[PDB]
Amino acid sequence: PKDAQMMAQILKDMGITEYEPRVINQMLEFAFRYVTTILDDAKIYSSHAKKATVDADDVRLAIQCRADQSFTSPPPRDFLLDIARQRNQTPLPLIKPYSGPRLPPDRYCLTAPNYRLKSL
Amino acid sequence: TPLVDFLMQLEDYTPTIPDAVTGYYLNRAGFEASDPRIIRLISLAAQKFISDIANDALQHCKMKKYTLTMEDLTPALSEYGINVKKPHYF
Amino acid sequence: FHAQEFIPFRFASGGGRELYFYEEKEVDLSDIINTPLPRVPLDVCLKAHWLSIEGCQPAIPENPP
Amino acid sequence: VASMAGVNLSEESARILATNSETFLLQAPLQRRILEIGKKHGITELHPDVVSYVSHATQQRLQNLVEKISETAQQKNFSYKDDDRYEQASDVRAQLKFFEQLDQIEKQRKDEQEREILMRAAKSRSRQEDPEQLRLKQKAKEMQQQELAQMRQRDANLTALAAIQRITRVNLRDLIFCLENERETSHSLLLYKAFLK
Amino acid sequence: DPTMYEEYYSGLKHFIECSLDCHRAELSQLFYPLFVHMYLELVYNQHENEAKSFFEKFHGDQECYYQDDLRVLSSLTKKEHMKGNETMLDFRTSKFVLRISRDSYQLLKRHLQEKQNNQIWNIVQEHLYIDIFDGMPRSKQQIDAMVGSLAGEAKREANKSKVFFGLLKPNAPPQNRIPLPELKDSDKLDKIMNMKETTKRVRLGPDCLPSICFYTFLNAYQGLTAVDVTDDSSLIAGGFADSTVRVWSVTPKKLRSVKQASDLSLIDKESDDVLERIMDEKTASELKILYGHSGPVYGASFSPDRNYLLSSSEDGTVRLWSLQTFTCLVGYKGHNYPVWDTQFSPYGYYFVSGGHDRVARLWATDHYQPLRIFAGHLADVNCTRFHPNSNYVATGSADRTVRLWDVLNGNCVRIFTGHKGPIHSLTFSPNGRFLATGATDGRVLLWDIGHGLMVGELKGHTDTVCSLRFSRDGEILASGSMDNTVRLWDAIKAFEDLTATGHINLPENSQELLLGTYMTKSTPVVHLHFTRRNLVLAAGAYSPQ
Amino acid sequence: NQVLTKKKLQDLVREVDPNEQLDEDVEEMLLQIADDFIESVVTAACQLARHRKSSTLEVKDVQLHLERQWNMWIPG
User: Any idea what the CATH number is for the domain that residue E29 is in?
Assistant: 2.130.10.10
- What long-range pairs does F44-47 form, CB within 8 A, spacing at least 24? F44/A65, F44/A68, F44/F69, F46/D37, F46/D38, F46/D40, F46/D41, F46/D43, F47/A61, F47/A64, F47/A65, F47/D41
8 A C-beta contact, residue E204 and residue E471 = yes
> What is the number of other CB atoms lying within 10 angstroms of the CB of residue D56?
17
Residues linked to residue E385 through DSSP beta bridges, in sequence order: E394
- Under an 8 A CB cutoff, do A100 and D103 touch? yes
- Under an 8 A CB cutoff, do E217 and C43 touch? no
| Nearest C-alpha neighbor of A64 from the set E412, C10, E83 | E83
> Which of F69, F70, F71, F72 is most worth mutating to test chain A (most A CB atoms within 10 A of its CB)?
F69
- Under an 8 A CB cutoff, do E291 and B28 touch? no
What is the DSSP annotation of B36-72? HHHHHHHHHHHHHHHHHHHHHHHHHHHH------HHH
Quick one: resolution in A?
A: 9.8
Residues of D in contact with B79 (CB under 8 A): 3-6
Coil, strand or helix at E435: strand
Q: B18 vs chain C: nearest CA distance in angstroms?
A: 12
Neighbours of chain D (3+ CB pairs under 8 A): A, B, C, E, F
Report the distance separating Cα E291 and Cα E116, nearest Å.
Answer: 68
Sequence-ordered strand ranges (E) for D58-182: 86-88, 168-170
- Under an 8 A CB cutoff, do F29 and D175 touch? yes
> If you measure CA to CA, which chain B residue comes closest to C24?
B90
> If you measure CA to CA, which chain D residue comes closest to E333?
D195
Report the distance separating Cα E232 and Cα E472, nearest Å.
Answer: 12
User: No. of H helices and E strands in chain E?
Assistant: 14, 31
8 A C-beta contact, residue A16 and residue A33 = no
Please count the residue pairs, one from chain B and one from chain E, whose beta carbons lie less than 8 angstroms apart: 16
Is residue E440 exposed (0-12), middle (13-18) or buried (19+ Cβ within 10 Å)?
Answer: buried
Task: Give the closest of E184, E269, E370 to D101, CB-based.
Answer: E269
Look up residue E484 and give its DSSP letter.
Answer: S
| Nearest C-alpha neighbor of E400 from the set E387, E383, E412, E385 | E383
Neighbours of chain C (3+ CB pairs under 8 A): A, B, D, E
Chain Cα centroid distance, residue E22: 34
CA distances (Å), origin B51, targets B18, B55, B57, C14, F32: 16, 6, 10, 17, 42
- Under an 8 A CB cutoff, do A4 and B89 touch? yes
Sign of CA dihedral E201, E206, E211, E216: positive
- Under an 8 A CB cutoff, do B49 and C8 touch? yes
Report the distance separating Cα D103 and Cα E387, nearest Å.
Answer: 28
> If you measure CA to CA, which chain D residue comes closest to A79?
D189
Task: Give the closest of F44, F52, F53 to A65, CB-based.
Answer: F44
User: Phi and psi dihedrals of D59, rounded to 5?
Assistant: -70, -45
Residues of F in contact with A40 (CB under 8 A): none
| Nearest C-alpha neighbor of E505 from the set E137, E255, E256, E189 | E137
Report the distance separating Cα A17 and Cα D133, nearest Å.
Answer: 78
- Under an 8 A CB cutoff, do D46 and F66 touch? no
Radius of gyration of chain F (CA): 15
Task: Give the closest of E325, E336, E369 to D180, CB-based.
Answer: E336
Residues of A in contact with E372 (CB under 8 A): 87-88
Task: Give the closest of D91, D99, D189 to A75, CB-based.
Answer: D189
Write out residues 61-90 of D within 8 Å (CB-CB) of B.
85, 89
Look up residue B79 and give its DSSP letter.
Answer: T
CA distances (Å), origin E419, targets B11, B53, D101, E74, E399: 59, 54, 50, 22, 9
Residues of C in contact with D8 (CB under 8 A): 5, 7
A26 touches chain B (CB under 8 A): no
Q: D46 vs chain C: nearest CA distance in angstroms?
A: 30
In chain F, the number of structural domains is: 1
Report the distance separating Cα E536 and Cα C49, nearest Å.
Answer: 12
Task: Give the closest of A101, A103, A118 to D86, CB-based.
Answer: A118
Report the distance separating Cα D64 and Cα D12, nearest Å.
Answer: 8
- Under an 8 A CB cutoff, do C8 and B85 touch? no
Task: Give the closest of A48, A68, A69 to F60, CB-based.
Answer: A48
8 A C-beta contact, residue E119 and residue E126 = no
Chain Cα centroid distance, residue E177: 25
Report the distance separating Cα E72 and Cα A14, nearest Å.
Answer: 8
Q: F35 vs chain D: nearest CA distance in angstroms?
A: 9
State the SS3 of chain F.
CCCCCCCHHHHHHHHHCCCEEECHHHHHHHHHHHHHHHHHHHHHHHHHHHHCCCCCCCHHHHHHHHHHHHCCCCCC
Neighbours of chain F (3+ CB pairs under 8 A): A, D
Coil, strand or helix at D140: helix
Parallel, antiparallel, or unpaired for β B82-83 and C2-3? Answer: antiparallel
Report the distance separating Cα E314 and Cα E223, nearest Å.
Answer: 14
**What one-letter code names the amino acid at E367?**
H
F47 touches chain D (CB under 8 A): yes
> If you measure CA to CA, which chain E residue comes closest to A114?
E327
Task: Give the closest of A1, A33, A119 to B85, CB-based.
Answer: A33
Q: A26 vs chain E: nearest CA distance in angstroms?
A: 20
Q: Please, do chains E and F touch (3+ CB pairs < 8 Å)?
A: no
Is residue A17 exposed (0-12), middle (13-18) or buried (19+ Cβ within 10 Å)?
Answer: exposed
Task: Give the closest of A1, A22, A33 to C16, CB-based.
Answer: A22
- What long-range pairs does E88-95 form, CB within 8 A, spacing at least 24? E88/E36, E88/E40, E89/A76, E89/A77, E90/A76, E90/A77, E90/E151, E90/E378, E91/E36, E91/E40, E91/E150, E91/E151, E91/E378, E92/E37, E92/E40, E92/E41, E92/E44, E93/A77, E94/E151, E94/E378, E95/E127, E95/E128, E95/E129, E95/E151
CA distances (Å), origin A95, targets B34, E279, E363, E387: 37, 28, 14, 20
User: No. of H helices and E strands in chain B?
Assistant: 4, 1
**What one-letter code names the amino acid at A94?**
L
> If you measure CA to CA, which chain B residue comes closest to E241?
B28
Write out residues 1-40 of C within 8 Å (CB-CB) of E.
none
Q: B90 vs chain D: nearest CA distance in angstroms?
A: 31
Sequence-ordered strand ranges (E) for E292-338: 297-301, 309-313, 317-321, 328-333
> Which of A2, A28, A115 is most worth mutating to test chain B (most B CB atoms within 10 A of its CB)?
A28
CA angle E219, E220, E225 (to 5 degrees): 160
8 A C-beta contact, residue E399 and residue E385 = no
Residues linked to residue E426 through DSSP beta bridges, in sequence order: E437
Parallel, antiparallel, or unpaired for β E392-396 and E385-386? Answer: antiparallel
Buried b (16+ CB within 10 A) or exposed e, E374-406: bbbbbbbbbbbbbbbbbbbbbbbbbbbbbbbbb
> If you measure CA to CA, which chain A residue comes closest to E69?
A14
Host domain of residue E50:
4-158
| Nearest C-alpha neighbor of E536 from the set E460, E456, E479, E459 | E479
CA angle E302, E307, E310 (to 5 degrees): 40
